[PDB]
Design a protein around this ligand. Structure first.
Ligand SMILES: *CCCCO[C@@H]1O[C@H](CO)[C@@H](O[C@@H]2O[C@H](CO)[C@@H](O)[C@H](O)[C@H]2O)[C@H](O)[C@H]1O
Ligand SMILES: [Ca+2]
Length: 214
């Protein structure tokens, strides 16, 4: 059925790949407008997503999304999140009503508030609440480390620097989704994220992405 294996080095933009979110806010708990102009590719070949103030307590943030959808297989990122309260840095897979399907996502989240920790979650058809905070013995934000999840029909495995950190066993997502990375600040969730203190510009770097199909 879907999208085949690729390897993204982030030195050449080309069509039918990836698209940026621009000029709209996801609302609720994302307290920033997505700006296409906050997705910058560097000359050494790393996507650089940023969080910036447009106006005083008015912030803009950054999202990148694959045009195609991807299934079952191995997902790999080399990435450096932003450390700072009240923010998230992620790489996930997503589909939603938004796309005309059941909301299916698996994810890796770096809560800027603690980047010596990662949050593993997934959502099958709206039900999520499967969050696993693992403690990586380093600061994710002092450098580039590889983060994989093996999405399968029976389990989801998660790997930090080739080390198995978490497996998921009950009700695993089964709709193909887009690969999505972003940097956003939140409202309401002071509890989960901490409070964003207004500090900017913040940025998460993504060195490369690889999806290996089965
Ligand atoms: C799982 C926790 C992190 C993000 O959750 C989901 O993020 C999606 C992308 O940021 C978002 O879906 C997008 O919403 C916009 C606004 O309607 C659409 O343009 C896009 O098609 C859709 O994927 C979800 O809102 C959220 O659950
Ligand atoms: Ca690159």
């Amino acid at each position: 059925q879907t999208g085949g294996s690729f390897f993204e080095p982030f030195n050449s933009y080309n069509s039918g790949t990836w698209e940026k979110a621009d000029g709209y806010s996801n609302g609720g708990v994302f307290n920033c407008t997505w700006r296409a102009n906050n997705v910058n590719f560097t000359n050494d070949g790393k996507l650089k997503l940023g969080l910036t103030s447009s106006a005083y307590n008015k912030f803009d943030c950054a999202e990148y999304r694959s045009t195609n959808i991807y299934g079952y297989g191995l997902y790999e990122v080399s990435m450096k999140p932003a450390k700072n309260t009240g923010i998230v840095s992620s790489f996930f897979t997503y589909t939603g009503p938004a796309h005309g399907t059941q909301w299916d996502e698996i994810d890796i989240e770096f809560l800027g508030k603690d980047t010596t920790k990662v949050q593993f979650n997934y959502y099958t058809n709206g039900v999520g609440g499967h969050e696993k905070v693992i403690s990586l013995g380093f600061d994710a934000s002092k450098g580039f480390h590889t983060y994989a999840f093996d999405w399968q029909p029976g389990y989801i495995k998660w790997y930090v620097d080739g080390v198995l950190k978490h497996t998921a066993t009950a009700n695993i997502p089964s709709t193909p989704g887009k690969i999505m990375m972003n940097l956003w600040n939140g409202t309401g969730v002071d509890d989960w994220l901490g409070s964003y203190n207004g500090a900017n510009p913040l940025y998460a770097e993504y060195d490369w992405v690889k999806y290996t199909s089965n």
